[PDB]
Each structure stands twice: as structure tokens, then as C-alpha cells.
Amino acid sequence: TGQEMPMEMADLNAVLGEVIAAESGYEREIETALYPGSIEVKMHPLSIKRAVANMVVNAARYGNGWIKVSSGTEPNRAWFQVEDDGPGIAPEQRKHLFQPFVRGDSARTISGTGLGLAIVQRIVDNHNGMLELGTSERGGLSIRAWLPVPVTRAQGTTKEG
Numbered sequence: 001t002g003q004e005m006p007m008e009m010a011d012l013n014a015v016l017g018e019v020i021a022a023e024s025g026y027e028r029e030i031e032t033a034l035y036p037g038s039i040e041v042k043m044h045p046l047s048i049k050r051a052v053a054n055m056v057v058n059a060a061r062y063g064n065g066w067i068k069v070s071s072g073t074e075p076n077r078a079w080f081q082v083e084d085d086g087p088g089i090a091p092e093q094r095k096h097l098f099q100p101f102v103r104g105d106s107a108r109t110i111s112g113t114g115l116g117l118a119i120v121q122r123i124v125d126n127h128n129g130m131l132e133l134g135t136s137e138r139g140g141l142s143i144r145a146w147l148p149v150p151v152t153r154a155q156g157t158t159k160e161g
């Protein structure tokens, strides 16, 4: 009990630093490398917090060679990416990785009734930024999540001549 306003203005380096101190308790070889300055995106520190955790849970339990949590940003668009060692995505699964949008006139559902815990997807989906997956030779997988910032005022230096 105590108010509950979600999706608001939050720093991406501030939310990741919270999940870092939480996921860094015993061998969670998490290499932190956030934008050394100050990010700023209106997001939900909750959903995002869970989005970074469930991401390392796959490299910590099965994986155990190296985990990496980094965050960057740009003018009118900040984002954060992760990296972990392991086998990487499969050759066939790369095509069926919880991809949204379908194309067909029939689904042919045989079974699979229960709950729908698609965490992570609704996260970047509730922000409206981006979500992509990459892998270097199925050896160095890295996640690319984006979070667009609300209108701002950043021009930079520009001489007239």
C-alpha cells in the first residue's frame, strides 16, 4: 500500500544498477558497462527489472563462463544490451523464438492450455521501443533492447562560419 504509478520517467542506468546489485551475489559474473553519463527514458523500473533478471537466469544456471550487463544511449533514444557465453540460439529455433505477428488462415492448435507467462515481451512492448536478438557464430549471443525517450531538447555544438 503506497501509491503505484508505473511507466514514468526513469534512468536506464539506474534500473540496471539495481538489477546488477541484486544479480551479483554469488558468481554472477556480470560485467557492468552502462552509459557513463546519464540516461533518461520514461519506463517502468519494475517490468524492466524483471526483464534483465530472467535474461541472466539462462546464462547463470546452465551457463557459467561469463555474464555481461551493459547499457548505452543516444540523442532521443536510449537502450541496453546483454551478452553471455553458451551454445547460442539453435539453427531451427532462430525461426520460432516467441515471434509476434503470424501469417496464415489456420493455426492447427493441437494442445498446450494453461497460463501465458511471456515476461520480457510485454516489457519492451509496453515501452514501444524495440527488441532484437543477435549471435556471433552461435557463441556470443547479445540482446538488443531499445527504449525511445519522450521529446527533448538536444542540439549540440554547431558553428555558422
Ligand SMILES: Nc1ncnc2c1ncn2[C@@H]1O[C@H](COP(=O)(O)OP(=O)(O)NP(=O)(O)O)[C@@H](O)[C@H]1O
Pocket (backbone or CB within 6 Å): 058, 084, 088, 089, 090, 093, 094, 097, 098, 133, 141, 143
Ligand atoms: N540469451 C538469449 N536471449 C534470447 N533468446 C535466446 C537466448 N539464448 C538463446 N535464445 C533463443 O531463444 C530461446 C531461449 O530463450 P527463450 O526464447 O526465452 O526460451 P523458450 O524456448 O522460448 N522458452 P523456454 O526456453 O522453455 O524458457 C532458445 O530456444 C533460443 O532459440
